[PDB]
Design a protein around this ligand. Structure first.
Ligand SMILES: CCCCC/C=C\C/C=C\C/C=C\C/C=C\CCCC(=O)OC[C@@H](O)CO
Length: 134
């Protein structure tokens, strides 16, 4: 029983964020800034209802969802695309499929020990982030 992801989480590693952003067609100048940054993630979770806020000195991104309920997601200030998003549980892993113009786009987020893991996929690029609880 490790579905409770509530907390404030600080990034400690961010593997292949450059490749993930390139797969999303983020321009070089934006990648140059974004790859430098430590992200913070605040998760407010009530059962299957999630409110998430990911922050940095350069851009912030909020996404709220209920597990099992498809929603329209606009990735404002990231790659600025519209997708249909669905988050489901696979065991205690949150799995999101973002259906839209990019093939094989989604993410998976789970608790393991005292860490939050987030793997973001776009095409053949996977970015693996690890966060430690504040
Ligand atoms: C927002 C801080 C990073 C900004 C970097 C600025 C520009 C880079 C442009 C595009 C890169 C694409 C995505 C950024 C990566 C992670 C932010 C969270 C994405 C997400 O939905 O979290 C999954 C899940 O945690 C949400 O609940």
């Amino acid at each position: 029983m490790t579905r409770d992801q509530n907390g404030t989480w600080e990034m400690e590693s961010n593997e292949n964020f450059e490749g993930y952003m390139k797969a999303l067609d983020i321009d070089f100048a934006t990648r140059k800034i974004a790859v430098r940054l430590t992200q913070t993630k605040v998760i407010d979770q009530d059962g299957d209802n999630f409110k998430t806020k990911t922050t940095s000195t350069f851009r912030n991104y909020d996404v709220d969802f209920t597990v099992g309920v498809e929603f329209d997601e606009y990735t404002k200030s990231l790659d600025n695309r519209h997708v249909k998003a669905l988050v489901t549980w696979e065991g205690d892993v949150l799995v999101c499929v973002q259906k839209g113009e990019k093939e094989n786009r989604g993410w998976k987020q789970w608790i393991e020990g005292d860490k939050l893991y987030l793997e973001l996929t776009c095409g053949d690029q996977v970015c693996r982030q690890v966060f430690k609880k504040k």
